Design a protein around this ligand. Structure first.
Ligand code: CLA
Ligand code: CLA
Ligand code: CLA
Ligand code: CLA
Ligand code: CLA
Ligand code: CLA
Ligand code: CLA
Ligand SMILES: CCCCCCCCCCCCCCCCCC(=O)OC[C@H](CO[C@@H]1O[C@H](CO)[C@H](O)[C@H](O)[C@H]1O)OC(=O)CCCCCCCCCCCCCCCCC
Ligand SMILES: CCCCCCCCCCCCCCCC(=O)OC[C@H](COP(=O)(O)OC[C@@H](O)CO)OC(=O)CCCCCCCCCCCCCCC
Ligand SMILES: CC1=C(/C=C/C(C)=C/C=C/C(C)=C/C=C/C=C(C)/C=C/C=C(C)/C=C/C2=C(C)CCCC2(C)C)C(C)(C)CCC1
Ligand SMILES: CC1=C(C/C=C(\C)CCC[C@H](C)CCC[C@H](C)CCCC(C)C)C(=O)c2ccccc2C1=O
Ligand code: SF4
Lengths: 80, 146, 73, 40, 33, 132, 131, 743
């Protein structure tokens, strides 16, 4: 459904993965930052488009960007 | 005593067993209604439903329509009812096409194309005929006086 | 209505209506093939602007015509 | 005193006082020189 | 007579035509080619 | 192993029976009252507990509440109409907020957000700048 | 367990503007567009639940559930690869008197259950398997 | 020891001006300092939210008690000013002598900039603004007579204001009560229901029986105000009272004995309205308060305190449970004794509801001398109290929601009434939605149907008293019941409680005070519209309370708070999903509801009640009875009401009513101004600000407190505020200007 992309400016603060309401983001090993960790979006099929993740990023400009797109039952948050 | 319990003993389903939802009265009435009754063929189900709805529809038009005070008011009311029945029948036809498709197999399941078509046909006949019956009845009203 | 009221409120209300239709006997027989949902953010803006615009033009159109014709014609 | 003066130095308070003064002087000018649409 | 045309066409244009058109659109948007 | 609840009109609907359904499980050391996302209050059982919901978010919301009770053994599954089940969370056994060796990066662009291509350049291509 | 059951759906990702099937598929294999209620003694949604004497509330009769025993299997299957990576690393770090990966797994999971096994660092594992 | 005791902490907070110089001290976040303009706005928006400023109920409670003293002080100063202005800037004396001709005025404008035009020739060799609050009538009923007395009550008011302010300081800085003291509901109710209300009524009855009644009788008879004996004289010389009421001769002997009948001279159940003044008989009012006093005092002895006898509210609440309601009312006591928001909800709703009742009962049964004939005052009071009520009711709902989000605890509420309500919320909201649609389609449809029919030249097909008719049969029936009550179901009464139900036309000064108000098809149509408006308001507000903590869309709304902008652009859009936003939308509907009600009052009265009657029986209503056949269509309201009754404001220039014209225009402007906040978004504004800041920077200067755009929530608030001010303001001027003329 929606598209979430992570950029090299990430600092591995883990704040984004701790804010997702649907477990779409994970922290994976990396060497480009001091923390030695980067964020990934393995399960974008469950993204609802809340953008809470973006609100949590501390980088000058979001290192995590959510681009809204095709809509499915899951993305539209339909319990019915 | 608790008169409200989880439906079907499932504490997580979105429904509750209230006196209104599950009382002998409600169960009995719904079981014997033409729509859910057992044994009725698709055509007969439609017929009963149509007979019921056509009889009460002639009233509103006949007593409150544009030509209510005219001598031909009842006739006009009948025509108006027939028009409404046609509109509703179009809806039924269209619904069936979209919901069921083009070729069916199960058969005798109100929820199939063939069965739905039969159901629709019954409704039309029953409704129009019922409206006609009301016309005959409303032509001369009994005072039931001895 | 479309301009001041936004989606959240309406979406929640529509959800309740869905529950009702699915739980009301007789009507349960008929069901939708396109899930009922609230209008989108941009859609509401467009719908509202159109309603505002159409009303704006129509009301003045009547005034400019009836006032002029009613007095000088 | 020092603290109270600081409160009196807050933005809202100072604005009100200044505007009251400005309004007053304008009103007073019109009281003594009234009805002017030009410098005579 | 042409004078009768207003009373024969208006009923069709404002009632029959719109209905069939709407029905067709519904059938078109509810179909899965 | 269902927790003690008296029922609500905010439970699951047909989609749960014809499209897809979810389920969360956890273990408790005491019987305590929690608030369910559907609406209302329920009492968990002293031991295993299972509850069904219609959305993953509803399940994960409850997990947050569970963490307050110091319960961190929750598991979430998706049950399809045919009976197939998918284990969803914690997927690898380790919560996502904790780096676990063995997880690969996905959807990562190796440049600042400002280095994406210009829209005009990719015209009549079908791709987007952020996917280019 | 068909780990691809969800992925095997009718959804077809579009060119641009779609994340894709993701990790567990984007949509249910089954179509939600089923029919409505049916008369007593009839069924509508294919493998639907008979409403008995209350066909009007048939949709409220659950037929989809999770077997606790089956639940264990799905947990193991979907986390098989992770377990493999974990044990592999443990093996690489010169295990004391090592035997076979599988054997080690059984021994290491006999203790520390399975969930605990998945959440333990190779170092902790080696300490645990010192014996 | 004793269950009910007084616990107070001495010297709790030091009095100093240090915190005054540290704006934002109350908040941890704001205290750090200003970095953007948002800090300024937040300072003012979080000033009185004590729950967020402290985590101890005792502290929050202490602040509330003291803050209340502050409001009381302000109220006292307000009343004091009014009496003073009525002593030094009014024509009360002249009006007192000739109430029918002289017009009430208590405000005078300085002769600056032609504003003097606003000083009208009210009468009595006096020029000022015609006030419409009804002070003169009240003072006459009390028996003021002089302006010296008004001065003294003003001084008393100032003194009282000071005492209250001291009390606030004292009970917060020097003697602050502890939480245990506050949590004594039974005692509080006993004291407030027997002391505040019971003793209050009894005391008032004393004034009315010994001072007001006698003086007013003399005034009505014709005695010149100067010739009426001073109040103290009546209190001392029993003989004087005996002359007026021939029972004081017997003294209090009849009272101690059981012969209360002898006091029938001043305690009566006459009913109806005094023919001379057009107001309720004071004798009846005196008996009213006396009777109420006894009732309240008795009621104040129902709850247990420190002597065993009495009721414990907890026990009463818990016992009331049934087969369909689980644990029943268990848990409510704790909620109402541990949550200020919950208490405010109930109290605020009831207070607002009372105001609406006051509005209805105070016009049908005019309570003051020479009030009914003053159409301006009557209209002003009805509308004023109708509004105050609407706001308060919506406020109750708001605080109810704040409770659910901040104080509700699942543990303390298991299978109680509250829990069960939140467990079938979908059903409640779904049904109410339908009810609203049903009512709205049918009620408003009637009007649209009629408009179409009249325009198509088919008047015989309209829903009118001359065609298809929809008569209010039930209401017509109740009216008859009330009309025939005197002498039957109410044997000892002498007349109808109100002439509205039926009776004769009471006229004072050639003007109609009250007349039977009849109900027909038009009334049916409007009443049902009122139902629709109120029902929709409840839907929005109730939905907010029930879905405050969670929803299918946002399962964790509680954590987000009571006032969050949204959850995001996802889920199709989650804008305005907070409970605060529901209150925001509810206020708009409350505005609509009240507006229609006040308009109904204005047109109905000016058409079927108010007017003049000749010496013989010829009644000429102000508008001429147009309500019956014109209020059945929307065009009628636009033409026969708004367009026609607005001729006064639009033509007020050059007169003492010019102010209303200017305000009418100003209000329209503010209403429109608000629409820019209600339709736009923060994004556009923030970007515009960026460009503007560029200019300032280009000239080497820019504020350190970086300029930022108003928050999403504040934008909505600013819009609603201006919208309400503008709309209400417009009607305010419209009504007042029209009323001045009709009077
Ligand atoms: C004149 C402007 C206007 C109108 C007509 C409406 C209409 C409505 N608002 Mg609304 N609203 C408005 C302005 C308006 N709003 C504004 C400015 C705001 C901002 C505060 C809101 C905020 C708002 C909220 C927050 C809520 C509403 C709700 C409602 C609905 C009430 C239910 C009802 O009576 O249905 C009847 C609707 C009618 C328009 C009646 C007239 C229609 C005819 C006369 C009846 C017969 C027509 C028939 C059905 C079809 C004819 C066929 C042919 C014409 C094609 C209704 C749709 C409530 C709602 O949805 O709950 C139900 C609700 O919660 N409004
Ligand atoms: C919504 C309010 C409303 C109502 C009640 C009416 C009523 C009426 N209109 Mg009118 N009209 C309205 C709005 C309304 N109008 C609006 C908004 C417009 C503008 C578009 C018009 C334009 C209009 C025209 C142009 C004409 C009328 C006409 C009529 C009359 C014919 C009635 C008819 O044929 O209905 C038929 C009704 C039905 C078939 C069904 C009625 C609904 C049923 C009774 C509900 C039953 C519910 C049931 C109790 C549920 C429980 C069941 C359980 C116990 C088993 C009637 C007096 C005609 C006329 O002669 O005027 C007098 C006419 O020519 N109307
Ligand atoms: C151009 C479009 C058009 C036309 C020609 C008409 C024509 C008519 N309308 Mg009307 N209407 C329209 C649009 C139109 N309407 C719209 C858009 C609305 C919504 C606002 C309404 C709402 C409306 C109401 C509420 C009412 C009418 C009524 C009437 C009838 C009054 C005259 C008469 O003798 O009644 C007396 C009636 C008769 C003599 C009966 C005539 C025979 C009927 C019409 C046969 C209909 C069969 C038709 C083929 C079925 C359609 C099939 C479908 C596939 C299209 C007349 C037939 C009134 C009426 O009585 O309705 C019937 C009435 O109450 N109209
Ligand atoms: C509800 C309270 C109330 C209200 C609304 C009014 C309103 C009015 N009174 Mg009135 N009055 C009141 C109570 C009230 N009074 C009381 C209780 C008394 C008894 C003391 C009086 C005694 C009184 C007299 C004796 C007179 C008025 C007059 C007036 C009119 C002119 C007001 C004025 O001075 O303008 C001009 C305003 C000023 C000169 C004040 C200057 C503005 C100050 C400096 C701004 C405030 C500074 C700010 C708070 C700084 C903050 C510091 C921080 C510590 C808080 C006006 C209609 C006058 C009038 O009608 O004359 C015809 C007049 O002569 N009143
Ligand atoms: C001159 C006497 C005096 C002094 C020096 C103080 C000093 C203090 N009080 Mg205190 N207080 C006083 C009188 C005084 N009080 C009185 C008479 C009352 C009863 C109403 C209170 C009630 C009170 C409460 C309830 C609280 C304080 C608090 C405080 C402390 C913080 C100051 C603050 O919040 O700034 C406030 C500065 C202002 C300028 C606010 C004035 C707002 C005005 C009154 C609104 C009305 C104006 C107008 C009429 C309405 C609009 C038109 C500070 C130690 C707070 C504290 O820190 O507690 C721990 C606190 O919670 N006081
Ligand atoms: C019989 C005793 C008594 C009386 C008269 C009151 C009266 C009042 N209480 Mg109260 N209270 C009492 C006992 C009493 N309480 C007890 C025992 C408790 C503890 C359980 C409380 C706890 C309490 C709280 C927690 C609060 C109140 C509040 C209030 C006020 C409500 C606002 C109102 O109606 O304004 C009416 C206003 C007036 C009538 C103005 C006059 C007020 C003075 C104080 C009356 C005192 C008597 C007076 C001097 C007459 C003496 C008679 C003499 C002339 C012969 C009101 C003044 C609220 C408030 O706002 O307090 C500030 C509030 O929050 N009370
Ligand atoms: C008994 C009355 C009463 C009391 C004690 C409270 C108390 C409270 N309310 Mg509440 N409320 C009430 C009535 C009341 N309310 C009513 C009637 C409504 C419906 C409109 C509301 C709606 C409401 C909302 C929606 C919210 C509160 C909140 C709050 C809390 C913080 C208030 C705050 O931010 O202070 C600061 C106070 C202000 C900034 C108000 C200043 C006045 C503004 C600027 C409007 C002035 C209009 C003015 C009269 C127009 C003059 C025109 C002229 C210029 C020409 C506090 C516990 C807030 C909260 O967070 O609760 C926890 C919150 O979100 N209340
Ligand atoms: C009927 C057979 C004989 C009729 C006759 O002889 O006409 C002779 C009569 C003529 O009756 C006419 O009535 C008018 C209005 O009052 C006129 O005023 C005259 O009375 C009269 O000339 O026809 C009838 O009115 C009775 C026929 C009623 C038909 C019953 C309804 C049957 C169902 C109709 C719907 C058909 C659509 C699909 C059906 C499935
Ligand atoms: C209204 C009739 C009434 O008062 O019934 C009252 C009914 C029975 O109440 P109980 O006597 O069982 O419970 C008693 C306690 O609530 C205290 O009175 O309660 C309901 O279930 C209301 C259902 C929703 C209301 C439907 C609309
Ligand atoms: C309220 C209520 C109720 C209900 C009621 C109702 C709702 C009723 C209805 C009724 C109805 C609604 C009925 C109907 C009827 C119908 C009819 C009776 C019909 C008939 C028809 C016929 C007989 C035939 C026709 C025809 C045809 C078929 C075709 C051909 C032609 C002809 C004509 C032959 C009761 C009492 C139960 C109880 C209480 C509650
Ligand atoms: C009322 C309202 C709705 C609900 C309005 C709805 C659902 C409109 C429904 C009625 C319209 C007329 C569609 C009805 C179409 C018919 C069912 C026929 C369709 C036939 C198809 C073939 C097209 C929103 O979704 C919304 C979203 C965001 C901000 C404000 C609002 C808002 O104010
Ligand atoms: S937009 Fe929401 S669901 Fe998607 S990754 Fe961010 S927080 Fe998770």
């Amino acid at each position: 459904s929606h598209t979430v992309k992570i950029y090299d400016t990430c600092i591995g603060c883990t704040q984004c993965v701790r804010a997702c309401p649907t477990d779409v983001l994970e922290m994976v090993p990396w060497d480009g930052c001091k923390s030695g960790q980067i964020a990934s979006s393995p399960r974008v099929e469950d993204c609802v488009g809340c953008k809470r993740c973006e609100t949590a990023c501390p980088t000058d400009f979001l290192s995590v960007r959510v681009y809204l797109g095709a809509e499915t039952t899951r993305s539209l948050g339909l319990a019915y | 005593a608790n008169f409200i319990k989880p439906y079907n003993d499932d504490p997580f389903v979105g429904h509750l067993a209230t006196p209104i939802t599950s009382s002998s009265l409600t169960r009995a009435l719904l079981k014997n209604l033409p729509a859910y009754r057992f044994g009725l063929t698709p055509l007969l189900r439609g017929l009963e439903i149509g007979l019921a709805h056509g009889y009460f529809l002639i009233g509103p038009f006949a007593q409150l329509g544009p030509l209510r005070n005219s001598d031909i008011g009842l006739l006009a009311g009948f025509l108006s009812t027939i028009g409404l029945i046609l509109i509703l029948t179009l809806g039924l036809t269209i619904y069936g096409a979209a919901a069921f498709g083009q070729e069916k197999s199960n058969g005798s399941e109100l929820q199939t194309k063939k069965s739905w078509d039969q159901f629709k046909g019954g409704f039309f006949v029953g409704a129009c005929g019922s409206a006609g019956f009301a016309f005959i009845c409303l032509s001369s009203i009994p005072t039931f006086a001895l | 209505m479309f301009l001041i009221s936004w989606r959240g409120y309406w979406q929640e209300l529509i959800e309740t209506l869905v529950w009702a239709h699915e739980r009301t006997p007789l009507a349960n027989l008929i069901r939708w093939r396109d899930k009922p949902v609230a209008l989108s953010i941009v859609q509401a803006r467009l719908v509202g602007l159109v309603h505002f615009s159409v009303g704006y033009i129509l009301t003045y159109a009547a005034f400019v015509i009836a006032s002029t014709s009613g007095k000088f014609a | 005193m020092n603290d109270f003066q600081k409160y009196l130095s807050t933005a809202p308070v100072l604005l009100t006082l200044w505007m009251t003064f400005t309004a007053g002087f304008i009103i007073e000018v019109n009281r003594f020189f009234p009805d002017m649409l030009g410098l005579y | 007579a042409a004078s009768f045309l207003p009373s024969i066409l208006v009923p069709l244009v404002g009632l029959i035509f719109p209905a069939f058109s709407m029905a067709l659109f519904f059938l078109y948007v509810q179909t899965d080619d | 192993p269902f927790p003690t609840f008296g029922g609500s009109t905010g439970g699951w609907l047909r989609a749960a029976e014809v499209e897809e359904k979810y389920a969360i499980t956890w273990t408790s050391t005491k019987e305590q009252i929690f608030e369910m996302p559907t609406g209302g209050a329920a009492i968990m059982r002293n031991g295993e507990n299972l509850l069904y919901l219609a959305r993953k978010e509803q399940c994960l919301a409850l997990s947050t509440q569970l963490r307050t009770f110091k319960i961190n053994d929750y598991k979430i599954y998706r049950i399809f109409p045919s009976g197939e089940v998918q284990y969803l969370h914690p997927k690898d056994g380790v919560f996502p907020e904790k780096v676990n060796p063995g997880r690969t990066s996905v959807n990562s662009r190796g440049f600042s957000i400002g280095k994406n291509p210009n829209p005009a350049s990719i015209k009549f291509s079908g791709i987007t700048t952020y996917e280019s | 367990v068909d780990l691809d059951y969800g992925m095997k759906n009718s959804y077809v990702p579009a060119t641009g503007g779609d994340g894709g099937q993701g990790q567990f598929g984007a949509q249910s294999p089954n179509d939600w567009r089923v029919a409505g209620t049916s008369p007593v003694g009839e069924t509508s949604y294919a493998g639907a639940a008979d409403g008995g004497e209350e066909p009007w509330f048939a949709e409220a009769i659950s037929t989809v559930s999770l077997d606790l025993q089956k639940a264990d299997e799905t947990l193991k299957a979907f986390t098989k690869d992770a377990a493999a990576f974990k044990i592999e690393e443990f093996a690489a770090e010169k295990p004391y008197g090592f035997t076979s990966s599988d054997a080690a797994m059984e021994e290491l999971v006999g203790k520390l259950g399975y969930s605990k096994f998945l959440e333990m660092s190779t170092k902790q594992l080696m300490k645990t398997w010192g014996t | 020891s004793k269950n009910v005791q007084v616990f107070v902490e001495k010297d709790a907070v030091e009095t100093s001006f240090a915190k005054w110089a540290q704006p934002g001290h109350f908040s941890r976040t704001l205290a750090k300092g200003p970095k953007t303009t948002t800090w300024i706005w937040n300072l003012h928006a979080d000033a009185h939210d004590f729950d967020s400023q402290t985590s101890s109920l005792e502290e929050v409670s202490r602040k509330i008690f003291s803050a209340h003293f502050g409001q009381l002080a302000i109220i006292f100063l307000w009343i004091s000013g009014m009496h003073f202005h009525g002593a030094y800037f009014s024509n009360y004396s002249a009006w007192l002598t000739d109430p029918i001709s002289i017009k009430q005025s208590s405000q005078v404008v300085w002769p600056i900039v032609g504003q003097e035009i606003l000083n009208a020739d009210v009468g009595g060799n006096f020029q000022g603004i015609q006030t419409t609050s009804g002070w003169f009538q009240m003072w006459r009923a009390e028996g003021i007579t002089s302006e010296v007395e008004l001065y003294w009550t003003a001084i008393g008011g100032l003194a009282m204001s000071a005492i209250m302010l001291f009390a606030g300081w004292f009970h917060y800085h020097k003697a602050a009560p502890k939480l245990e003291w506050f949590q004594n509901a039974e005692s509080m109710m006993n004291h407030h229901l027997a002391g505040l209300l019971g003793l209050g009524c009894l005391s008032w009855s004393g004034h009315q029986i010994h001072i007001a009644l006698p003086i007013n009788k003399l005034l009505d008879a014709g005695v010149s105000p100067q010739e009426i004996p001073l109040p103290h004289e009546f209190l001392i010389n029993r003989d004087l009272m005996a002359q007026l009421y021939p029972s004081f001769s017997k003294g209090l002997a009849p009272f101690f004995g059981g012969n209360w009948g002898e006091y029938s001279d001043f305690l009566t159940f006459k009913g109806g309205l005094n023919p001379v003044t057009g107001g309720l008989w004071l004798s009846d009012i005196a008996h009213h308060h006396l009777a109420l006093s006894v009732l309240f005092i008795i009621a104040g002895h129902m709850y247990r305190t420190n002597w065993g006898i009495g009721h414990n509210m907890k026990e009463i609440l818990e016992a009331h449970k049934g087969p369909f309601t689980g644990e029943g009312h268990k848990g409510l006591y704790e909620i109402l004794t541990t949550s200020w928001h919950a208490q405010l909800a109930i109290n605020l709703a009831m207070m607002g509801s009372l105001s609406i009742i006051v509005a209805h009962h105070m016009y049908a049964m005019p309570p003051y001398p020479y009030l009914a004939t003053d159409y301006a005052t009557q209209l002003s009071l009805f509308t004023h109290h109708m509004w105050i009520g609407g706001f308060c009711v919506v406020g109750g709902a708001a605080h109810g929601a704040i409770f659910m989000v901040r104080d509700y605890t699942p543990a303390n509420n298991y299978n109680n009434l509250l829990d069960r309500v939140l467990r079938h919320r979908d059903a409640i909201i779904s049904h109410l939605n339908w009810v609203c649609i049903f009512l709205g389609c049918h009620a408003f449809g009637f009007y649209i149907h009629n408009d179409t029919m009249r325009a198509l030249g088919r008047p015989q097909d309209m829903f009118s008293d001359k065609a298809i008719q929809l008569q209010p049969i039930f209401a017509q029936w109740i009216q008859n019941i009330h009309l025939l009550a005197p002498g039957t179901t109410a044997p000892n009464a002498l007349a109808t409680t109100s002439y509205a139900f039926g009776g004769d036309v009471i006229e004072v000064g050639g003007k109609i005070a009250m007349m039977p108000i009849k109900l027909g098809t038009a009334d049916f149509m409007v009443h049902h519209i009122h139902a629709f408006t109120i029902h929709v308001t409840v839907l929005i507000l109730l939905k907010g309370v029930l879905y405050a903590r969670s929803s299918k869309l946002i399962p964790d709304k509680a954590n987000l708070g009571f006032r969050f902008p949204c959850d995001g652009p996802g889920r199709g859009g989650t804008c305005q999903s907070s409970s605060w936003d529901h209150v925001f939308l509810g206020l708009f509907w409350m505005y609509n509801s009240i507006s229609v009600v006040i308009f109904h009052f204005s047109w109905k009265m000016q058409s079927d009640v108010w007017g003049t009657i000749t010496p013989d029986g010829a009644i000429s209503h102000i508008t001429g009875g147009n309500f019956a056949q014109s209020s059945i269509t929307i065009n009628g309201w636009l033409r026969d009401f708004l367009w026609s009754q607005a001729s006064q404001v639009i033509q007020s220039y050059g007169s003492a009513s010019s102010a209303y014209g200017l305000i009418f225009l100003g209000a329209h402007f503010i209403w429109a101004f608000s629409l820019m906040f209600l339709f736009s978004g923060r994004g556009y504004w923030q970007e515009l600000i960026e460009s503007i800041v560029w200019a300032h920077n280009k000239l080497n200067f820019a504020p350190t407190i970086q300029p930022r755009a108003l928050s999403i929530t504040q934008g909505r608030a600013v819009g609603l505020a201006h919208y309400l001010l503008g709309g209400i303001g417009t009607t305010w001027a419209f009504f007042l200007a029209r009323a001045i003329s009709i009077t």
